[PDB]
């Protein structure tokens, strides 16, 4: 029935503005303060509300729009961004995070697009920041290497996302530009009773430490898991236990 | 001269010119000695010493690489048995032996091992066996059980190599090694490489924290030694040390090492 009809109305959405990031905060441990956001995609839909990334982002694929997407997933991060510092010069370095699908990292363009994004809304370098999953970099490690030198000497940060799945490869880890890590959702909110998940967690944190990589922890549900983490020396922490996805004019709350 | 050495192997292994030789592992803060690796060398009766890079692939061309495997087994058990009676004192006392490629998949891997160390009246985890981390790449949930079986029957596990290729974090958390190898390349060019400096430092910390002794491997000098019990590394090995003994060579270096 309506996988059909959403292509029709997910033509042309992209232009009309009714793809927007929401915004969840990332804290830091140590200080409890804001220290950032994770941009995420929402498709709010005239007829049918707010719609997630897994119902309409499948379709975005096929279509052939990722690309369109992604460029305005950014554009829209970084404008926010920089309104936001224009509004609170209190705040110095909030950084955003946009997430890259698996090959958005080749596309063409990409390092020219976020150059100009930084210029445009003056930002710091490492103030906007493009999370990627290792599959883009065990699809061809050496490539990847050259491709992220390159955004990072435009001025993006770099995110590891979901590490901990898959391979989880220190070694190649050493030799890719990140300065962030992310524990995945899954090994955070099963470290209190999953052994297994427990390992995972507290080696991800002291690599972080020994590569001079910043960690992100993600989902954390409660302050019980928030403690724990901090015990632990781990940076920062994202999860429903301090705020989901929040629109511009929620998020603008806690600046 | 491929053939011919390929002619000479037939019946090699049964004629017992395939043997180990053993290079010392050592703890690093004491200096004192823990155990041995055990190396495959074969002593060609025209040829002389041959290295495993110059017979391996040949083992392997012909289906032999279990009879090999068996066969060090079994002669790296036999003279750790020996050892272990010759020096009740050192309790922790093993013997390594390198299993290549695709064998943990072998059927009758398990019972071959236990057997081993039932015959040699072998104390658990005496004798280890070192894999490489592509022979469990290839199918990981496989070679957890196979190896968390070899456990049980009393085998010591090291992984060999570590730092090369994946160097998988997750993986590692789950399979049942007690110790963790880090590859000569890394030990031997972290004094001038801020990348193989920083495999070193992490893969000993990733190893200390998932209780697993961690062996520096290739340790050449005085100096790479110091700077490893410096990072906090359990063990090393390394022609700094001694190289692969013959086995009269390695009884003296064990007698010696009862003096501090
Ligand atoms: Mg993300
Ligand atoms: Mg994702
Ligand atoms: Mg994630
Ligand atoms: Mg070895
Ligand atoms: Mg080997
Ligand atoms: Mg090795």
Redesign the pocket.
């Known amino acids: 029935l309506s996988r059909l009809a959403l292509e029709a109305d997910l033509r042309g959405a992209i232009g009309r503005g009714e793809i927007t990031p929401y915004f969840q905060p990332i804290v830091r441990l140590s200080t409890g303060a804001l220290s950032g956001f994770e941009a995420l995609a929402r498709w709010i839909h005239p007829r049918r509300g707010m719609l997630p990334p897994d119902e309409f982002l499948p379709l975005i694929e096929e279509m052939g729009l990722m690309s369109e997407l992604g460029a305005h997933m950014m554009h829209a991060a970084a404008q926010q961004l920089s309104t936001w510092r224009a509004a609170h010069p209190a705040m110095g370095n909030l950084t955003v995070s946009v997430?890259l699908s698996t090959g958005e990292i080749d596309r063409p363009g990409l390092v020219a697009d976020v150059a100009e994004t930084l210029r445009v809304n003056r930002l710091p370098r490492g103030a906007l920041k493009l999370?990627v999953?290792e599959s883009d970099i065990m699809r061809d490690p050496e490539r990847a290497a050259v491709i992220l030198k390159t955004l990072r000497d435009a001025g993006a940060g770099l995110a590891l996302?979901?590490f901990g799945t898959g391979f989880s490869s220190l070694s190649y880890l050493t030799r890719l530009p990140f300065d962030t890590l992310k524990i995945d959702r899954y090994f955070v909110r099963t470290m209190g009773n999953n052994a297994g998940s427990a390992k995972i967690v507290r080696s991800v944190v002291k690599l972080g430490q020994d590569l001079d990589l910043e960690v992100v922890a993600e989902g954390v549900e409660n302050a019980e898991m928030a403690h724990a983490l901090q015990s632990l020396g781990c940076d920062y922490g994202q999860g429903f236990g301090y705020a989901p996805a929040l629109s511009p004019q929620e998020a603008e709350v806690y600046l």
Do not use: R, V, W
Request: proline content about 0%.
């Open positions: 997430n999370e999953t996302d979901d």
